[PDB]
Ligand binder design. Structure first.
Ligand SMILES: *[C@@H]1O[C@H](CO)[C@@H](O[C@@H]2O[C@H](CO)[C@@H](O[C@@H]3O[C@H](CO)[C@@H](O)[C@H](O)[C@@H]3O)[C@H](O)[C@H]2NC(C)=O)[C@H](O)[C@H]1NC(C)=O
Ligand SMILES: *[C@@H]1O[C@H](CO)[C@@H](O[C@@H]2O[C@H](CO)[C@@H](O[C@@H]3O[C@H](CO)[C@@H](O)[C@H](O)[C@@H]3O)[C@H](O)[C@H]2NC(C)=O)[C@H](O)[C@H]1NC(C)=O
Ligand SMILES: *[C@@H]1O[C@H](CO)[C@@H](O[C@@H]2O[C@H](CO)[C@@H](O[C@@H]3O[C@H](CO)[C@@H](O)[C@H](O)[C@@H]3O)[C@H](O)[C@H]2NC(C)=O)[C@H](O)[C@H]1NC(C)=O
Ligand SMILES: *[C@@H]1O[C@H](CO)[C@@H](O[C@@H]2O[C@H](CO)[C@@H](O)[C@H](O)[C@H]2NC(C)=O)[C@H](O)[C@H]1NC(C)=O
Ligand SMILES: *[C@@H]1O[C@H](CO)[C@@H](O)[C@H](O)[C@H]1NC(C)=O
Ligand SMILES: *[C@@H]1O[C@H](CO)[C@@H](O)[C@H](O)[C@H]1NC(C)=O
Lengths: 651, 651
């Protein structure tokens, strides 16, 4: 590293401290918009919903990037905010902020505080109901809001929460869809919890004027990517998939008929669907399945995928910093925990490579790096944050990791990856709260412990070289860490307390990164490919692209994109460009899809929209979203036998 | 509170410190037996069950009342303990301690470390299975142990964990019964979570040689008092069946009011408290009280709050005064109240606000809400449930908040010296507390983020408190333990600093209480009665007794019981000595049971063991356990009719 710039003098002039006198309850801090100036500090209280309580939430606004906060509590006089609700921030550049509150004395409805100018000016609005869930912006229109009342009434607002109109009265759960479509379940008898398995799923495209019952005997439903899900009670629970907003459905097809199992949707996008199916009976870990572009035909993707028995949380992770990369945890035959990583969107999984920082070697199960995610959070392990990545910060992945030793499981370490998870390196000791900013230019981290802290660990070279910085002589008990939005942001905000009086610390890094990076500061790198050969070194699902990376200890402000230029180029297909077909799987550290043993010599059939099909394949099919052309082109054929099996438990 | 005796000198010589070097993971501490001087300190690790990990738990033992601890880790080396298991301490005089462990490298089964001499000498025994749950002693015999394996197998041991024998293989939940009877549920298809509502309840009296399927279509089952409960699925509808003869004959619970949700709050040798959720799951239900057979219930309390996910309530049984119970309800203003009964659920009143209320601005404001399991489930800052002891007659210590949302975030510690009738705020902020010396000493420790070093104790039943600095190096509090015994004077605190180094502090109060109390140290008091007149002031279910209470700032050792040892005089019956009969209820602040509106002009019929009965009552029935004679005695009569209904879905 050899970092010798006097960072103390550059940061001391930029360390803006603001003391908040006597804040009771949980304190929330949020930057509002990029390059706006607006920082909100809200006071929240943990209070049961239906209980009417007295209280006054304190609100402070800064319009000068954390330098001075103005007390604007009179805006929300005689109201208070609950912790589970908090702020309702709209999409990027929408400038919309909703503050759902409750009247201090009590009322016949809630009260919101609405703003469209990046929280610079709020307006008061009395709700004709008490909200059960938080306001939900529509992905198509930020002016449209749906909410659920304490009386299970569905309320819609067309004008950014000013006027609300109830559209149904027995709603259990409502979610936005594409093009302002609202999907919601309703019941008739008693309660929602008593009629689980006997619910009706309705659709509305007119914001409450037209309805269409698209499903009966519904247990639950969800949206993911271009797919609509619904668990239907056949008693037996089966997952049905719809891509046409619920007009036509199709039952999910697995290479087996495992009755009364437990199904779960890990993730889904505009290409495919990740499904987690629990192992039969109560054995623990399940098996991941990958679907086609229609989300109907699944195949075994990864065996022994761990999950939490009560909750169902897994270590499945979306590497947002590199396309097609996903990381999760599995259990080996030695009953040790491993971290599996795929670079081809679930096509082939391989073990996570142990860090180059070799400080280690059933002794082989030891030294295996386990990246903690939602499964580790549910197991009550000391993991303060899930894996964090950003699309702007291409290749940067920061997360907690442990070793096979139970001591390292009790105290995980912070690992940094600059190639999307292919290689790792221990950079920080102990658990930390971290964030990414400046499109990956600055990475901050704060110690997570019981003692008060006062040290900022940051890095300007994408987490390659770190250096500490004391930002206060009065240590504070850490509460939260926030960053300014935008691609060229350079500020953070830390707020904590002593013993109890609160205080915030806003740090500017503009003086640290005084020089703009040049071509002698950027080293390039290519994404990892499971197949050998220089022809596809750097190809990501059939698309080869080049990426930039700051050199070690590069103290400079990067104002460029990490994807270089356009340069469209197609790669030839290979093993990494094809999923295993219906009834096929890849053995451990293998590159060929063999056929499942119990399916050899049988009729490969699966009911596709109520019509049976016969599959004749070599064991491969194209990955949904893969744009490879040429090279490997295996032969597969779907033969329509016109024989009809019932695969739709909906009207 | 004119307390000026030098507490520093008496406690400093009795404050014994011991430091533990290089401790990783959670730290448990337990006194082993009364007047034995044995203290165990165990290191536990939070590790998933089916995952085989490497680790070593450290074990320390003190045999001189916490003055010196000896490292005895070599006894349990190459093994580790999970935090969810910990120690398995038997009854007080049993001297039995079980240490369920897991082999550091992995094995075919767990390993236990058994001791019968108050943890003075342990023996090693390899289990033929991996335990899913902790060892369960039997109430009839401490030598009998049942455990549940990771493969849902039920194992029993007749000789204190020395030899184990499996008796069933598809068990979902097992519980001990009276006289070593074992009740357990089993399935057949798939898993236990999928067979909910279709389970078989079996009985065993010979530790696994003979069986008897006493129930079919079972959803759940539990034990309480002299009653066995079983949630039976009729169609689909879930109904509760009560059995007093260990499951040989059942009888469905009869209530004055479809597909609702039932819950068992508490159960005695006399009656049963039953919670029934209102149709809609709006967060509140109704408490029902039964007869001596636990069949005929009646509306005892309306709008009883419960957690929607979990079903926990604020129902608290004041063990320090017979027939007193405290729970939380929801008012018509949707504010939370604490209701208290002094006649075992016959009549409920509002908890009286403390004297000289600091909040004295509104009517619903200033109301005291005692926190219990419901507040714990609401994720409120309540470290302990209400604490009381039958030895410490009348003493109740609990956390309480006000109508303000700030007070809910930081509840205060309230003390009652009359079983819950009157209260007073004694300590600011949450605390961990304990009772000692049969009520002579009440210790309390501040709960916060900062390190602590103060012991708050009271010798006059919590009327006057005094702080005590037990260390110059403050520690982060972890746990507070007490030596068993009616005349115990020792406590054990253990915490850490900042790596992280642990330390324990054992404090003896023998020198504080050097004088035995005398006649001018005790002030007499009578229990509270809802009915007016001096003829019933002090009656508890027909028995009037006089209780003793230490004067304010009474620094002395209690020599006699707080109850004047006589034969108590019998009280004449009145309205407070009668429950509301089947189909009746008491309105708010009303002492007369009026008939339920929807039942006026109908045949009050309830199926008693498959046979109809006709109720002709004035609206009252004697409380099970009330021994009053004379006074009021309204007429009621149960005539066996000719109709024979079906009130049993079991065979
Ligand atoms: C992080 O916060 C700082 C403030 O501490 C943001 O820097 C910028 O602060 C300057 C003043 O130092 C504002 O610049 C301008 O001042 C000139 C006169 O000197 C005036 O003519 C302009 O109208 C403007 O007020 C500047 O607007 C402010 N910029 C932002 C984005 O708020 C800093 O930019 C923040 N982080 C980043 C890099 O976004
Ligand atoms: C409310 O809390 C009290 C706290 O003690 C519970 O205490 C006790 O419950 C036990 C078990 O039924 C009673 O013990 C019984 O003693 C009689 C003596 O004749 C004996 O024959 C029985 O076999 C049993 O051991 C005990 O009397 C009772 N409380 C006291 C100390 O008076 C009580 O169960 C809880 N209330 C409810 C409704 O569950
Ligand atoms: C709370 O802990 C203290 C110790 O810190 C206990 O006081 C101790 O009482 C025991 C009684 O067994 C004394 O033990 C010794 O017993 C042997 C038996 O042969 C005898 O030879 C010794 O002369 C001695 O009596 C021990 O010395 C004594 N320690 C102190 C400092 O008082 C106390 O009993 C515990 N609390 C309660 C209420 O039991
Ligand atoms: C998170 O996973 C999703 C897939 O589950 C990825 O989704 C697409 O990412 C690309 C950019 O790499 C976007 O252009 C698409 O709009 C995303 N949505 C789709 C196809 O559903 C996503 O890349 C991962 N995280 C991020 C934001 O990079
Ligand atoms: C806040 O509202 C209350 C009404 O509940 C009013 O009495 C009070 O004056 C208001 N305070 C301010 C500063 O406006
Ligand atoms: C258990 O302790 C013994 C010494 O008491 C030690 O030699 C051994 O290495 C430990 N366990 C194993 C098998 O490693």
């Amino acid at each position: 590293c050899g970092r010798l710039p006097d960072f103390i003098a550059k940061l001391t002039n930029n360390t803006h401290q603001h003391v908040f006198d006597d804040l009771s309850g949980s304190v929330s801090l949020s930057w509002v918009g990029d390059s706006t100036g607006v920082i909100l500090v809200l006071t929240t209280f943990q209070v049961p919903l239906v209980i009417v309580s007295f209280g006054q939430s304190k609100l402070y606004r800064s319009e000068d990037y954390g330098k001075n906060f103005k007390d604007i509590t009179n805006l929300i006089n005689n109201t208070f905010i609950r912790t589970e609700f908090g702020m309702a921030i709209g999409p990027e550049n929408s400038g919309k902020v909703i503050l759902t509150a409750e009247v201090s004395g009590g009322s016949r409805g809630g009260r919101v505080f609405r703003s469209s100018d990046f929280a610079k000016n709020f307006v008061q609005t009395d709700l004709p109901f008490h909200p059960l869930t938080q306001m939900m912006y529509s992905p198509q229109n930020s002016d449209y809001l749906l909410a659920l009342s304490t009386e299970n009434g569905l309320w819609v607002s067309k004008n950014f929460g000013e006027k609300w109109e109830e559209i149904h009265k027995a709603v259990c759960l409502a979610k936005w869809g594409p093009n302002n479509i609202i999907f919601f379940t309703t019941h008739v008898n008693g309660s929602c919890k008593a009629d689980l398995g006997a619910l009706e799923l309705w659709r509305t495209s007119d914001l409450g004027k037209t309805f269409k019952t698209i499903g009966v005997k519904i247990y639950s439903f969800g949206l993911g990517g271009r797919f609509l899900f619904a668990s239907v009670m056949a008693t037996t629970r089966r997952i049905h998939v719809s891509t046409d907003q619920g007009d036509t459905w199709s039952m999910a097809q697995l290479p087996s008929v495992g009755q009364e199992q437990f199904y779960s949707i890990l993730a889904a996008n505009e290409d495919m669907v990740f499904m987690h199916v629990d192992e039969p009976g109560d054995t623990g870990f399940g098996t991941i399945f990958t679907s086609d572009d229609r989300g109907i035909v699944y195949s075994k993707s990864l065996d022994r995928h761990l999950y939490t028995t009560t909750g169902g949380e897994t270590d499945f992770t979306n590497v947002t910093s590199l396309r097609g990369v996903y990381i999760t945890s599995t259990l080996s035959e030695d009953n040790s925990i491993q971290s599996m990583i795929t670079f081809d969107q679930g096509g082939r999984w391989e073990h996570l490579r142990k860090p180059e920082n070799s400080k280690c070697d059933k002794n082989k199960n030891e030294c295996s790096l386990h990246i903690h995610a939602s499964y580790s959070i549910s197991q009550k392990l000391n993991v303060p944050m899930a894996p964090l990545s950003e699309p702007n910060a291409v290749g940067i992945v920061i997360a907690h990791g442990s070793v096979g030793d139970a001591i390292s499981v009790m105290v995980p370490d912070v690992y940094i990856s600059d190639d999307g998870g292919y290689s790792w390196a221990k950079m920080l000791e102990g658990p930390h709260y971290y964030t990414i900013l400046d499109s990956g230019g600055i990475i901050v981290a704060i110690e997570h412990s019981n003692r008060p802290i006062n040290v900022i660990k940051f890095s300007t070279d994408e987490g390659q070289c770190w250096q500490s910085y004391v930002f206060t002589q009065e240590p504070i008990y850490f509460t939260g860490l926030a960053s300014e939005p935008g691609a060229r942001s350079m500020n953070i905000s830390i707020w904590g307390f002593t013993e109890r009086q609160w205080v915030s610390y806003t740090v500017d890094f503009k003086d640290i990164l005084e020089r703009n990076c040049e071509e002698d500061d950027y080293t390039t790198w290519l994404a990892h490919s499971t197949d050998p050969g220089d022809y596809k070194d750097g190809c990501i699902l059939g698309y080869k692209e080049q990426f930039l990376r700051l050199r070690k200890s590069s103290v400079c402000q990067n104002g460029r994109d990490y994807v270089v230029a356009k340069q469209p180029s197609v790669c030839p297909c290979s093993l990494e460009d094809f999923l295993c077909d219906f009834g096929y799987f890849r053995p451990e550290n293998a590159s060929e899809c063999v056929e499942q043993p119990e399916l050899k010599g049988h009729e490969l059939e699966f009911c596709l929209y109520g019509k049976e099909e016969h599959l004749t394949t070599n064991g491969y099919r194209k990955i949904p979203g893969d744009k490879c052309q040429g090279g490997m082109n295996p032969a597969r054929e779907v033969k329509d036998l016109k024989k009809k099996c019932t695969s739709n438990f909906l009207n």
